[PDB]
Amino acid sequence: IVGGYTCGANTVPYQVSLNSGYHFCGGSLINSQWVVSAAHCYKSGIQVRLGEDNINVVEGNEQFISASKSIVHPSYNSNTLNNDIMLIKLKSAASLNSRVASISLPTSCASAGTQCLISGWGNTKSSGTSYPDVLKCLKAPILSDSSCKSAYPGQITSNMFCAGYLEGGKDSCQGDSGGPVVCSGKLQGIVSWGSGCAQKNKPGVYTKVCNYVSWIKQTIASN
Ligand SMILES: CC(=N)N1CCC(Oc2ccc([C@H](Cc3ccc4ccc(C(=N)N)cc4c3)C(=O)O)cc2)CC1
Ligand SMILES: [Ca+2]
């Protein structure tokens, strides 16, 4: 997260860290047994880490649970990142408490202008590399589709939305992928892609979660 602020230990209880010997992507806990992340984060041998603050220090509030199965969206296109969403089932149910909580799915999509909270352990530099060990947060509004499509001609589908600032300076970045974009207390987006990080006229692109609620519910109930 570039231009954000330190969230504070366990202030984003639904945030998860996907680990394969190291942190590689973020995710969101939707219930005690399921995690939603980005399809481009797919890997074999994923361990889900909950209750995390500093990813390099064990503070006693963590729960490390291996994934039993991963389900990438059936229409995921790796070339365009259309339908960049995947579901991960935990081998054992997570114990929900103050520091480990689930985030609710939307009843409707969020309108442009709505302020959201984006979080992650990704790169904090727009130019250069500096990975934080503590969770970073960023408040950002959902941008109009026009501004989004103008920034990325012919690359934005109805399953994506832009959020952030056209002037640059604040944005999600590499390492934040698969992470949560929560607006009005509901999971509205998943960190997907963009052009660089925090660059002028290049806002972040996120998977529009409100389009997948039916698929999510049917899939988790059948697996
Ligand atoms: C042809 C087409 N339709 N495209 C091209 C691919 C594009 O997807 C991608 C997929 C991956 C990449 C990465 C770089 C990357 C990865 C994750 C990111 C996550 C967030 C942000 C951001 N600035 N908000 C930027 C990122 C940038 C890389 O360098 O490999 C960049 C664009 C979708 C749009
Ligand atoms: Ca830790």
Amino acid in the structure at residue 86: M
Whether 84 and 76 have beta carbons less than 8 Å apart is answered as: yes
Contact partners, residue 197, CB within 8 Å, separation at least 6: 2, 123, 125, 126, 171, 172, 173, 174
Phi, psi of 5 (to 5 degrees): -140, 155
Ligand 1 touching residue 120 (CB < 6 A): no
Whether 190 and 181 have beta carbons less than 8 Å apart is answered as: yes
The rounded distance, in Å, linking the Cα atoms of 197 and 13 is 25
The rounded distance, in Å, linking the Cα atoms of 72 and 61 is 29
Residue with tokens 């109930």: 221
Best residue among 2, 166, 193, 200 to mutate for probing ligand 1's pocket (most ligand atoms within 8 Å of CB) is 193
Ligand 1 touching residue 187 (CB < 6 A): no
Residue with tokens 């979080």: 119
The DSSP code sequence of 153-212 is TTT--TTEEEES-TT-S-B--TT-TT-EEEETTEEEEEEEE-SSSS-TT--EEEEEGGGS
Q: Which helix (H) or strand (E) holds 161?
A: strand 160-163
The rounded distance, in Å, linking the Cα atoms of 136 and 123 is 10
DSSP 211: G
Is 174 marked as binding a ligand?
A: yes
All domains of the chain in start order, with CATH: 1-12+103-210 (2.40.10.10), 13-102+211-223 (2.40.10.10)
Q: How was this structure determined?
A: X-ray
| Residue positions annotated with a catalytic role | 40, 84, 177
Query: Is beta strand 136-141 parallel, antiparallel or unpaired with respect to 160-163?
Result: unpaired
Closest CA to 70 of 91, 100, 52: 91
The rounded distance, in Å, linking the Cα atoms of 141 and 112 is 7
> From ligand 1's centre to the CA of 196, what distance in Å?
8
Whether 24 and 179 have beta carbons less than 8 Å apart is answered as: no
Residue with tokens 């992507």: 25
